[PDB]
């Protein structure tokens, strides 16, 4: 399975989803910068939209364990 | 890990896989449970950075983890190299380099390097102080997945 | 723990995973039955402070009876140092300090320091006191969880 | 979980709710004073009615084995 | 694997039955998932190019897999080498001879030949190079059998 | 369970209650003597009337494979 396949679904958590993230970006071999770019990108924007809500509210400069604990009830 | 032999000196002998599968084990069976810490810490002695980085990167699941504690370990790294500044002029033919923090999270030091530190003297404890960042981070988890 | 080596003397080595899962299975199959008290004292054979503290903070579940114990742990320390005043005056250089409770709880003291005391010429068996208050706390326990 | 959201059930035994307490206070972090403050407050405020009124009959000084054994009956 | 002894020299030791198992029990869980790699590194410290085609013709299963690591072993090796031609004129009576593709393969040389290269001062890794080789095919295969 | 507690049914074989007595006379830490008092005592007590009928037939100075052996039909 490719990263860009990597989503979330609408019911759910996105904590199931980060996981399968970094699983999917830790068979990714890419430059670290690429894979930053990745991080801030794709991660957000195949986020369900209750989350992705959330989450443009975070602003940027977030961490994980903030984007964790704020969509923890979504 | 660097252990002592018979003779009386400090050498380094390879970890043992029931070892390492008794690490699996416990994480496997207990996740982010507090024995975990204690549990680790016992593994942990006499190990190098490089057998701790073996440790890290052996896990399987539980990636966002995974991921906070890289993420503090680089943030306890850049921290480091931040309260220790590099010394005067160039390194002595005499004597062997001070660390960086990515010396001791192992990624710009080798092994023969690592054992230098240990066990030259002054030894230098480079074990314990990524020790106390995943213990930091180990923390940073545990409070984060109390529920 | 600390054992004798095969040169005549008095070393630490560390104890063994399977010893370390022994005592963690001891707990959970037989968990507050009398029989856990000389299981126990076997395990603890030539055991460290540090140790038998490796020991209880590796435990997981009874939390009740683990902070009963402590307590109890606590209580015994807190009575060796009513009974066992400091002595007099500064600490000669030849020689080296008394334990105070928290020393025998393994917690004030170093292992380097609980290797002094225990290897040195008189010994003081600072594993025994701490081991009768774990068999006082365990028969409290034990007392208790009758039912 | 969060401490304060450690409560005893209507049924629950307190023995069971004691183990939850020490569990939860076992993954706070804070200083030994504010640990012991946790101790006497919250455990008795948190506990049922039938207990909590066994238990205020016991006064202050009391010890574990003898709330454990107090509460036992309810 | 060839192994420090006691006396402080570096001799062979066969590698032991329930490593040998580890290896396969390895396979057999985790398959083509990343952690095998880790893995494989830790259970091929020390070791030996003889001791490694070990490992890769005990392995039962996955043949298209172990084709396509067998092909990727040749097109390194192949490229070995490319990059480092054979070197002039015949080989000195006080010196043992340059290694090629196959030699890190383990296929053209014997034991001893492979304990005096690595034993031998300067030391040549043959090890870590079928390592890289191993690793870099390890990459393709993960890559391919992501689905 | 107190060692009072400890009794004998009316169908249960003396042999399963014994076995019951030395479990909870091996949670009981007093002095050997009370122990022995204990023993001569609470355990003919507690058994039950057919076999205590047995066991009242064999007198003081009575030993446990006799005892064992004396209330096995019942």
Same mark, same amino acid.
């Given at each position: ?74 | ?8 000196? &400090? ?54 983890? &995974? ?10 790294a850049?921290e480091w190299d931040?309260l220790h ?16 923090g990515?010396?001791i ?12 530190? &240990? ?24 409070? &984060?997945?109390?529920?």
């Amino acid at each position: 399975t490719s990263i860009l396949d990597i989503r979330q679904g609408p019911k759910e958590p996105f904590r199931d989803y980060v996981d399968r993230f970094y699983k999917t970006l830790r068979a990714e071999q890419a430059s670290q910068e690429v894979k930053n770019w990745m991080t801030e990108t794709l991660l957000v924007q195949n986020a369900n939209p209750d989350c992705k809500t959330i989450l443009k509210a975070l602003g940027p400069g977030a961490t994980l364990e903030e984007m964790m604990t704020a969509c923890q009830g979504v | 890990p660097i252990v002592q032999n018979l003779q009386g000196q &400090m050498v380094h002998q390879a970890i043992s896989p029931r070892t390492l599968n008794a690490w699996v084990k416990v994480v496997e069976e207990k996740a982010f449970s507090p024995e975990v810490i204690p549990m680790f810490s016992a593994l942990s002695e006499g190990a190098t950075p490089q057998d701790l980085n073996t440790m890290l990167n052996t896990v399987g699941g539980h990636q966002a983890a &995974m991921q906070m504690l890289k993420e503090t370990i680089n943030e306890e790294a850049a921290e480091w190299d931040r309260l220790h500044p590099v010394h005067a002029g160039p390194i002595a033919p005499g004597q062997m380099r001070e660390p960086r923090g990515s010396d001791i999270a192992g990624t710009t030091s080798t092994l023969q390097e690592q054992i230098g530190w &240990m066990t030259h003297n002054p030894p230098i404890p480079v074990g314990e102080i990524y020790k106390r960042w995943i213990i930091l981070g180990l923390n940073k988890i545990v409070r &984060m997945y109390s529920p």
